[PDB]
Amino acid sequence: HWGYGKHNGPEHWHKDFPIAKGERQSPVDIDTHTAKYDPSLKPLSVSYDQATSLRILNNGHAFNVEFDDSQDKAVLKGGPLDGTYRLIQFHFHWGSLDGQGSEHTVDKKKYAAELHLVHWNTKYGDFGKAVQQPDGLAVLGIFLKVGSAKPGLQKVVDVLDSIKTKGKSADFTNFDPRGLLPESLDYWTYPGSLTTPPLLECVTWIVLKEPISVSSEQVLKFRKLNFNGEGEPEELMVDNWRPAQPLKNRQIKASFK
Ligand SMILES: NS(=O)(=O)c1ccc(CCNC(=S)Nc2ccc(-c3c4ccc(=O)cc-4oc4cc(O)ccc34)c(C(=O)O)c2)cc1
Ligand SMILES: [Zn+2]
């Protein structure tokens, strides 16, 4: 099916997922000079103290650290959000080289990778119902640059060898996502979509301005993963990012002056 290769990559997705050419697609380039500070934005609240991680899975597109979202444990509120959004999973998008990998870009700058913490609006009951709503999801995006190692990320890095191929999963309990956040919560926000098929336009994007630093060694291990399943020709899981899409009259708002 769809992927990131030359024959099934982003430029081909529209054939099976027409919304790919929609009016609210993600990611987008964030032109910092055009983004406007929005006084109406309420304080952003990231409450991950009771987060319950459960498993890590290689789904053939990236790897997901899944959480128990049967209760209001890890939640995201405030900012441009109305109500409570529950953390369900987080994953990354990265490149084959340090100069690329992020999905959103800042003044056209591409980061080495991008972390996506996915949350769904609790007023819709479940994730399935949420992806049928214009405000069903909220994804917190964090940029990764290559520099000093990120202590909180190492546990994720060290388990990757156990889920090298598509379909493989491993227990991943007691992981604290707070160790992946930068110091500042300054952010840019705009209405968008999922960046991979089905590309549904149900996401309120909140992209943090401050990137986190990860070591070359850490990202190199991300690049050892496989898109393929076990026993198949090895296709390194790299460059699993979608390029910037047309803004289409949308406005990106800044939480800071
Ligand atoms: N990069 S990004 O933008 O951050 C991003 C990209 C992709 C995705 C996820 C893409 N895949 C989707 S959407 N998967 C999906 C959607 C709905 C359901 C779903 C479906 C679907 C059809 C239906 O008829 C009833 C469903 O009921 C459901 C009840 C639930 O409690 C949770 C999910 C769920 C399920 C599933 O079955 O696990 C998976 C997340 C973030
Ligand atoms: Zn993503």
UniProtKB/Swiss-Prot annotation:
SMART domains xref list: Carb_anhydrase
Ligand binding (Zn(2+)): 91, 93, 116
Cofactor remark: Zinc. Can also use cobalt(II) with lower efficiency, but not copper(II), nickel(II) and manganese(II).
Remaining remarks: Target of drugs used in treatments against glaucoma disorder and breast cancer.
Keyword set includes Lyase: yes
UniProt xrefs under PANTHER family: CARBONIC ANHYDRASE, CARBONIC ANHYDRASE 2
Effect of residue 89 to P: In OPTB3; in Czechoslovakia
GO biological process, one term: regulation of monoatomic anion transport
Effect of residue 118 to K/R: Strongly reduced CO(2) hydrase and p-nitrophenyl acetate esterase activities
Keyword Metal-binding on entry: yes
Record-given protein name: Carbonic anhydrase 2
Annotated consequence of substituting residue 2 to A: Impaired activity, not rescued by 4-methylimidazole (4-MI)
Effect of residue 4 to H: Reduced proton transfer rate
Cofactor(s) the protein needs: Zn(2+); Co(2+)
Effect annotated for changing residue 64 to L: Reduced activity
Effect upon mutating residue 139 to F/Y: Strongly impaired activity
Physiological role: Catalyzes the reversible hydration of carbon dioxide. Can also hydrate cyanamide to urea. Stimulates the chloride-bicarbonate exchange activity of SLC26A6. Essential for bone resorption and osteoclast differentiation. Involved in the regulation of fluid secretion into the anterior chamber of the eye. Contributes to intracellular pH regulation in the duodenal upper villous epithelium during proton-coupled peptide absorption.
Outcome reported for the amino acid change (mutating residue 15 to E): In Jogjakarta
pH dependence: Optimum pH is 6-8.
Binding site for substrate: 195-196
